[PDB]
Design a protein around this ligand. Structure first.
Ligand SMILES: *[C@@H]1O[C@H](CO)[C@@H](O)[C@H](O)[C@H]1NC(C)=O
Ligand SMILES: *[C@@H]1O[C@H](CO)[C@@H](O)[C@H](O)[C@H]1NC(C)=O
Lengths: 49, 49, 49, 49, 43
């Protein structure tokens, strides 16, 4: 059970914006210019790390 | 019959074919709130925060 | 003139002039389904919508 | 199609918040609203998040 | 019109989003009719 929960939580953490406009990287890179996309991707990277 | 809606948190259970078959209103009673916290319609014996 | 959008997923009544491409099944492909951008393999499904 | 929007008169202020000017025509939107009004030059800056 | 009062029971639940979900439990914050709430019968 414990292991499952951990993995489950990890998967749910992929659905968190962490302050970014979207939780999907492809949507961000298809929505914003590379400079601001860098900032949003940076927030997502920090959260996921 | 006329009733009025309210902002509520519901736990909805979807069946195999995709239709909602049961729901739990979190703010109704302590047992329903426990179910919402555990994300299950059955609660085993114990004390749950 | 202030243009107000809402960015979400599939359900959308407005897209850019981008044309279409015939469906491909059982191959790992990039897909843009009505604003939903992803990559995967597309198969016929028995899910009841 | 934002090609005609660009083809209209040169814009004193064309700033895109959620999205990126050029990345428009590449997105798919749920409810476009446009608000038209006439304001003074210094009042343009006040129309911003 | 004559007003009586009755119990709504577990009535008034609707699909919140345009998303198909199967064999899952989903939590939704939305406007719903509270369970076991008093509703008015008008004649
Ligand atoms: C509900 O699911 C059962 C189990 O597969 C299926 O036989 C039935 O056709 C489904 N009903 C509807 C309305 O989808
Ligand atoms: C609805 O019914 C309950 C149970 O009898 C009662 O306590 C409550 O006062 C009723 N609602 C109104 C508005 O009278």
């Amino acid at each position: 059970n414990h292991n499952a929960q951990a993995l489950n939580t990890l998967v749910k953490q992929l659905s968190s914006k962490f302050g970014a406009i979207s939780s999907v990287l492809n949507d961000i890179l298809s929505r914003l210019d590379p400079p601001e996309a860098e900032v949003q991707i940076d927030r997502l990277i920090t959260g996921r790390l | 019959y006329v009733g009025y809606l309210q902002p509520r948190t519901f736990l909805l259970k979807y069946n195999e074919n995709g239709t909602i078959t049961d729901a739990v209103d979190c703010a109704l009673d302590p047992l329903s709130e426990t179910k919402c916290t555990l994300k299950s319609f059955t609660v085993e014996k114990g004390i749950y925060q | 003139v202030v243009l107000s959008f809402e960015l979400l997923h599939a359900p959308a009544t407005v897209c850019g002039p981008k044309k279409s491409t015939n469906l491909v099944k059982n191959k790992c492909v990039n897909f843009n389904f009505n604003g939903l951008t992803g990559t995967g393999v597309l198969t016929e499904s028995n899910k009841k919508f | 199609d934002y090609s005609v929007i660009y083809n209209f008169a040169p814009f004193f202020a064309f700033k895109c918040y959620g999205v990126s000017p050029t990345k428009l025509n590449d997105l798919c939107f749920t409810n476009v609203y446009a608000d038209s009004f006439v304001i003074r030059g210094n009042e343009v800056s006040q129309i911003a998040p | 019109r004559t007003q009586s009062y009755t119990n709504s029971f577990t009535r008034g639940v609707y699909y919140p989003d345009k998303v198909f979900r199967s064999s899952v439990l989903h939590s939704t914050h939305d406007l719903f009719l509270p369970f076991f709430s008093n509703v008015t019968w008008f004649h």
